[PDB]
Tab-separated table of all heavy atoms in Angstrom:
chain	number	residue	atom	x	y	z
A	13	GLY	N	19.208	-21.716	9.187
A	13	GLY	CA	18.610	-22.076	10.449
A	13	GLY	C	17.955	-23.427	10.466
A	13	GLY	O	17.599	-23.908	11.539
A	14	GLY	N	17.790	-24.060	9.306
A	14	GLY	CA	17.119	-25.338	9.218
A	14	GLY	C	17.992	-26.485	9.663
A	14	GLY	O	19.158	-26.321	10.010
A	34	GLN	N	12.494	-34.891	16.477
A	34	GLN	CA	11.156	-34.538	16.898
A	34	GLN	C	11.276	-33.639	18.115
A	34	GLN	O	12.141	-33.855	18.969
A	34	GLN	CB	10.342	-35.788	17.220
A	34	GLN	CG	10.253	-36.768	16.063
A	34	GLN	CD	9.567	-36.184	14.840
A	34	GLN	OE1	8.606	-35.431	14.951
A	34	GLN	NE2	10.062	-36.538	13.661
A	39	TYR	N	5.220	-36.741	19.013
A	39	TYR	CA	5.062	-36.638	17.574
A	39	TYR	C	5.356	-38.003	16.985
A	39	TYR	O	6.375	-38.616	17.317
A	39	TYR	CB	5.993	-35.612	16.923
A	39	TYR	CG	5.998	-34.146	17.354
A	39	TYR	CD1	5.441	-33.704	18.545
A	39	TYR	CD2	6.464	-33.183	16.483
A	39	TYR	CE1	5.439	-32.385	18.886
A	39	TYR	CE2	6.450	-31.858	16.820
A	39	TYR	CZ	5.936	-31.466	18.018
A	39	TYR	OH	5.921	-30.137	18.353
A	58	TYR	N	16.060	-31.386	1.970
A	58	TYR	CA	16.078	-29.944	2.097
A	58	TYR	C	16.671	-29.522	3.424
A	58	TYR	O	16.936	-30.336	4.311
A	58	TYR	CB	14.682	-29.382	1.986
A	58	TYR	CG	13.798	-29.590	3.198
A	58	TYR	CD1	13.482	-28.536	4.037
A	58	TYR	CD2	13.222	-30.815	3.450
A	58	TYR	CE1	12.665	-28.720	5.119
A	58	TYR	CE2	12.399	-31.007	4.530
A	58	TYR	CZ	12.121	-29.955	5.357
A	58	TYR	OH	11.295	-30.138	6.437
A	60	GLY	N	15.694	-25.836	5.850
A	60	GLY	CA	14.931	-24.611	5.873
A	60	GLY	C	13.492	-24.800	6.290
A	60	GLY	O	13.212	-25.166	7.432
A	62	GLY	N	9.980	-26.630	5.670
A	62	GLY	CA	9.175	-27.731	5.183
A	62	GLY	C	7.929	-27.469	4.345
A	62	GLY	O	7.675	-28.198	3.379
A	150	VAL	N	28.682	-24.895	7.202
A	150	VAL	CA	30.077	-24.563	6.928
A	150	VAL	C	30.994	-25.614	7.522
A	150	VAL	O	31.843	-26.181	6.823
A	150	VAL	CB	30.408	-23.168	7.481
A	150	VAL	CG1	31.887	-22.895	7.350
A	150	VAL	CG2	29.604	-22.110	6.770
A	151	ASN	N	30.797	-25.919	8.806
A	151	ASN	CA	31.569	-26.939	9.496
A	151	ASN	C	31.344	-28.312	8.891
A	151	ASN	O	32.275	-29.115	8.819
A	151	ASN	CB	31.198	-26.942	10.972
A	151	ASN	CG	31.353	-25.587	11.595
A	151	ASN	OD1	30.382	-24.991	12.045
A	151	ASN	ND2	32.570	-25.069	11.592
A	154	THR	N	33.381	-28.443	5.548
A	154	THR	CA	34.798	-28.756	5.711
A	154	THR	C	35.061	-30.084	6.402
A	154	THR	O	36.167	-30.611	6.278
A	154	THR	CB	35.523	-27.633	6.454
A	154	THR	OG1	36.822	-28.075	6.860
A	154	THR	CG2	34.758	-27.198	7.606
A	155	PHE	N	34.083	-30.645	7.105
A	155	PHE	CA	34.204	-32.024	7.556
A	155	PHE	C	34.120	-32.988	6.381
A	155	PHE	O	34.792	-34.023	6.368
A	155	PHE	CB	33.112	-32.324	8.579
A	155	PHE	CG	33.122	-33.731	9.083
A	155	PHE	CD1	34.039	-34.133	10.028
A	155	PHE	CD2	32.209	-34.655	8.611
A	155	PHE	CE1	34.047	-35.431	10.489
A	155	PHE	CE2	32.223	-35.955	9.063
A	155	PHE	CZ	33.139	-36.338	10.005
A	158	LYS	N	37.364	-33.069	4.102
A	158	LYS	CA	38.407	-33.899	4.669
A	158	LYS	C	38.162	-35.390	4.466
A	158	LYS	O	39.121	-36.133	4.235
A	158	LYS	CB	38.535	-33.565	6.153
A	158	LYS	CG	39.621	-34.274	6.906
A	158	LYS	CD	39.793	-33.601	8.239
A	158	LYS	CE	38.615	-33.857	9.146
A	158	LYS	NZ	38.824	-33.176	10.441
A	179	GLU	N	28.484	-34.918	13.641
A	179	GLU	CA	29.294	-33.783	14.062
A	179	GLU	C	28.470	-32.588	14.525
A	179	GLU	O	29.050	-31.617	15.018
A	179	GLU	CB	30.223	-33.352	12.931
A	179	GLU	CG	31.365	-34.307	12.669
A	179	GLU	CD	32.364	-34.354	13.805
A	179	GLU	OE1	32.530	-33.334	14.504
A	179	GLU	OE2	33.006	-35.406	13.995
F	333	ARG	N	8.527	-23.397	13.662
F	333	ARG	CA	9.266	-24.325	12.832
F	333	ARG	C	9.302	-25.684	13.510
F	333	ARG	O	9.552	-25.802	14.711
F	333	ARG	CB	10.692	-23.834	12.590
F	333	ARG	CG	10.837	-22.479	11.901
F	333	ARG	CD	10.565	-22.517	10.420
F	333	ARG	NE	11.025	-21.287	9.778
F	333	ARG	CZ	10.258	-20.241	9.488
F	333	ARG	NH1	8.958	-20.269	9.757
F	333	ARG	NH2	10.786	-19.170	8.912
F	334	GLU	N	9.048	-26.713	12.720
F	334	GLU	CA	9.155	-28.092	13.164
F	334	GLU	C	10.590	-28.567	13.256
F	334	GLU	O	10.947	-29.277	14.199
F	334	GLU	CB	8.385	-28.999	12.201
F	334	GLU	CG	8.535	-30.476	12.441
F	334	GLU	CD	7.930	-30.902	13.744
F	334	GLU	OE1	6.918	-30.285	14.145
F	334	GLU	OE2	8.485	-31.827	14.375
F	335	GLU	N	11.422	-28.144	12.311
F	335	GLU	CA	12.757	-28.699	12.161
F	335	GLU	C	13.676	-28.254	13.285
F	335	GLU	O	14.330	-29.080	13.929
F	335	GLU	CB	13.337	-28.292	10.809
F	335	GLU	CG	12.635	-28.896	9.614
F	335	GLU	CD	11.468	-28.069	9.127
F	335	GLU	OE1	11.219	-26.990	9.694
F	335	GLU	OE2	10.809	-28.489	8.161
F	336	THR	N	13.752	-26.954	13.524
F	336	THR	CA	14.643	-26.405	14.526
F	336	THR	C	13.876	-25.473	15.446
F	336	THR	O	12.720	-25.126	15.199
F	336	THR	CB	15.812	-25.653	13.881
F	336	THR	OG1	15.296	-24.647	12.996
F	336	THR	CG2	16.734	-26.608	13.129
F	573	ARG	N	32.800	-35.718	23.800
F	573	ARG	CA	32.821	-34.364	23.264
F	573	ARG	C	31.715	-33.487	23.833
F	573	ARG	O	31.902	-32.275	23.945
F	573	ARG	CB	32.731	-34.401	21.744
F	573	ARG	CG	34.033	-34.732	21.073
F	573	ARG	CD	33.839	-34.955	19.592
F	573	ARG	NE	33.243	-33.810	18.920
F	573	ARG	CZ	32.898	-33.815	17.638
F	573	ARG	NH1	33.121	-34.888	16.904
F	573	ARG	NH2	32.342	-32.747	17.086
F	650	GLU	N	39.973	-33.328	16.116
F	650	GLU	CA	40.140	-32.079	15.380
F	650	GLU	C	38.812	-31.390	15.112
F	650	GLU	O	38.770	-30.161	14.993
F	650	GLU	CB	40.866	-32.378	14.062
F	650	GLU	CG	41.209	-31.201	13.164
F	650	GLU	CD	42.308	-30.317	13.717
F	650	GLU	OE1	43.151	-30.823	14.490
F	650	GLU	OE2	42.336	-29.115	13.370
F	651	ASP	N	37.727	-32.151	15.075
F	651	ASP	CA	36.438	-31.706	14.581
F	651	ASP	C	35.531	-31.176	15.674
F	651	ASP	O	34.361	-30.895	15.406
F	651	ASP	CB	35.755	-32.870	13.874
F	651	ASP	CG	36.543	-33.362	12.698
F	651	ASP	OD1	37.213	-32.536	12.059
F	651	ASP	OD2	36.519	-34.576	12.426
F	653	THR	N	34.036	-28.727	17.247
F	653	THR	CA	33.863	-27.331	16.880
F	653	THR	C	33.198	-26.521	17.991
F	653	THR	O	32.993	-25.316	17.836
F	653	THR	CB	33.030	-27.252	15.595
F	653	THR	OG1	33.369	-28.358	14.763
F	653	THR	CG2	33.359	-26.005	14.786
F	654	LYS	N	32.873	-27.135	19.120
F	654	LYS	CA	32.173	-26.428	20.183
F	654	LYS	C	33.023	-26.219	21.423
F	654	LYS	O	32.981	-25.144	22.018
F	654	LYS	CB	30.890	-27.173	20.553
F	654	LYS	CG	29.821	-27.148	19.492
F	654	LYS	CD	28.583	-27.840	20.002
F	654	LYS	CE	27.549	-27.997	18.913
F	654	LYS	NZ	26.987	-26.694	18.484
F	744	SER	N	41.606	-26.036	11.130
F	744	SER	CA	40.874	-26.683	10.048
F	744	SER	C	39.583	-25.949	9.730
F	744	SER	O	39.197	-25.842	8.561
F	744	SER	CB	40.575	-28.134	10.405
F	744	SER	OG	41.765	-28.874	10.564
F	745	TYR	N	38.913	-25.419	10.741
F	745	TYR	CA	37.565	-24.908	10.561
F	745	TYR	C	37.599	-23.391	10.545
F	745	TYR	O	38.355	-22.778	11.295
F	745	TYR	CB	36.646	-25.431	11.665
F	745	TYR	CG	36.332	-26.911	11.559
F	745	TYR	CD1	35.669	-27.573	12.556
F	745	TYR	CD2	36.686	-27.636	10.443
F	745	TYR	CE1	35.375	-28.915	12.438
F	745	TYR	CE2	36.395	-28.964	10.320
F	745	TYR	CZ	35.742	-29.595	11.317
F	745	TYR	OH	35.455	-30.921	11.184
F	746	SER	N	36.801	-22.787	9.670
F	746	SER	CA	36.922	-21.350	9.470
F	746	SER	C	36.290	-20.571	10.604
F	746	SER	O	36.704	-19.445	10.881
F	746	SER	CB	36.292	-20.944	8.148
F	746	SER	OG	34.890	-21.104	8.191
F	747	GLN	N	35.298	-21.146	11.269
F	747	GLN	CA	34.685	-20.440	12.382
F	747	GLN	C	35.573	-20.439	13.615
F	747	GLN	O	35.625	-19.426	14.322
F	747	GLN	CB	33.321	-21.037	12.687
F	747	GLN	CG	32.305	-20.770	11.601
F	747	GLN	CD	30.959	-21.356	11.925
F	747	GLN	OE1	30.790	-22.013	12.953
F	747	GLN	NE2	29.989	-21.134	11.049
Side-chain angles (χ1 to χ4, degrees):
Chain A
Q34 303 298 322
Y39 303 17
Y58 74 107
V150 173
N151 305 117
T154 167
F155 178 78
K158 183 167 70 180
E179 288 293 330
Chain F
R333 300 284 194 263
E334 173 66 33
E335 293 88 2
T336 55
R573 281 172 58 185
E650 183 71 27
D651 299 328
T653 325
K654 291 183 187 292
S744 297
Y745 289 171
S746 68
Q747 291 181 357

